Amino acid sequence: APATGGVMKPHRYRP
Amino acid sequence: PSCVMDDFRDPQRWKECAKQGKMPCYFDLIEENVYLTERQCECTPLSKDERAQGEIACGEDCLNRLLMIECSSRCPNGDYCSNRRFQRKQHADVEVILTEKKGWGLRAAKDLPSNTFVLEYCGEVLDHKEFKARVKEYARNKNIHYYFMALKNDEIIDATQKGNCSRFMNHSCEPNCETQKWTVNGQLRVGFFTTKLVPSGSELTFDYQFQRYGKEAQKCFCGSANCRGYLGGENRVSIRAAGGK
Ligand SMILES: C[S@@+](CC[C@H](N)C(=O)[O-])C[C@H]1O[C@@H](n2cnc3c(N)ncnc32)[C@H](O)[C@@H]1O
Ligand SMILES: [Zn+2]
Ligand SMILES: [Zn+2]
Ligand SMILES: [Zn+2]
């Protein structure tokens, strides 16, 4: 239904 | 076109700068999270002398710091505790700027050492029911930018209507910042920390790891050599999943 959208997901930076 | 954080402290001037395209659109600035429906360390106190020598209170070896818990006012180091960053609002010197294709974003206003606290990502904290309500509202208004940040499974931070300048950090497939979850007063918060030395004037970005529920994904202008091309990546996920289940 929503054309666009979403949630930012915290995560720790790993190289 | 860019502004400093204090330009956001005066809603009237803010508002008129916005009409001239000199500042981003208005939002309610808040100093800390607001719930839509409500729910000590072992450091040896630093001597007066060691403090004049410039030693650090609750530095790398503090026990609360290592667990990503901030110290209270009852900390052994008292006023000198350096492990109180979120509560003291001691953010990096940062500026809000208009980017070419991403809307507004964040720029370092001086060199930022590796692992420097940037800002807390503050907003209205939503449960699943409120999340879904807002998903609909934003889809229905036809919002372009999205502010939802997963905090813990039943808690999403929504910076759309209320928050601080953190809501401007753009995504990058090769970011110079990351989220960290810090415990302050029994409560969980998220903040951005540099992942490396960030030269003065550079844009501040993180990797959203975006979980997209929309039909179409927004294209990514990060400009990274490794750019994944879309915000959210390959997969589309259900709304319930994006929301933490
Ligand atoms: C938390 S906001 C950042 C603030 C936003 N730039 C603004 O002007 O309000 C996330 C939104 O910014 C935009 N955005 C952020 N990073 C982007 C990127 N790398 N490429 C394209 N659009 C981006 C998208 O519209 C996204 O929904
Ligand atoms: Zn300590
Ligand atoms: Zn302390
Ligand atoms: Zn990209």
Kindly describe this structure.
Chain B: Zn(2+) 3 binds at residues 173, 220, 222, 227. The complex is a heterodimer of chains A (15) and B (245). Chain A has one strand at 6-8. Helices cover 0% and strands 20% of the residues of chain A. The relative contact order of chain A is 0.20. With 15 residues, chain A is an all-beta fold. Chain A is built from no helices and one strand. Chain A is rod-shaped. With 245 residues, chain B is of the alpha+beta class. Chain B has one domain (1-245). Chain B is 16% helix and 24% strand. Chain B is built from six helices and 15 strands. Chain B has helices spanning 11-19, 48-52, 63-66, 85-88, 128-141, 239-242; strands at 2-4, 28-29, 34-35, 94-98, 104-108, 117-120, 124-126, 148-152, 155-158, 162-163, 170-171, 177-184, 187-194, 203-206, 211-212. In chain B, the strands form four sheets. Chain B has a five-stranded mixed β-sheet, with no helix packed on it. In chain B, strand 8 and strand 9 (155-158) form a beta hairpin. The chains are: A mainly beta (15), B alpha+beta (245). The A-B interface holds A 1-13 and B 135-136, 138-139, 142-144, 146, 148-151, 156, 171, 175, 178-181, 190, 195, 207-218, 231-232, 237, 239, 242-244. One zinc ion binds next to loops of chain B. One zinc ion (ZN) is lined by residues 173, 220, 222, 224, 227-228 of chain B.
Quaternary state of the chains? heterodimer
Domain module tally of chain B: 1
What fraction strand of chain A?
A: 15-25%
Give the biggest sheet of chain A.
Answer: none
Number of helices of chain A: 0
N-to-C span of chain B: 40 Å
Largest interface, chains and sizes: A-B, 13 and 40 residues
For the secondary structure, the number of strands of chain B is: 15
PDB class: transferase
Keywords: Methyltransferase, transferase
Assembly: dimeric
Entry title: Crystal structure of human SETD2 SET-domain in complex with H3K36M peptide and SAM
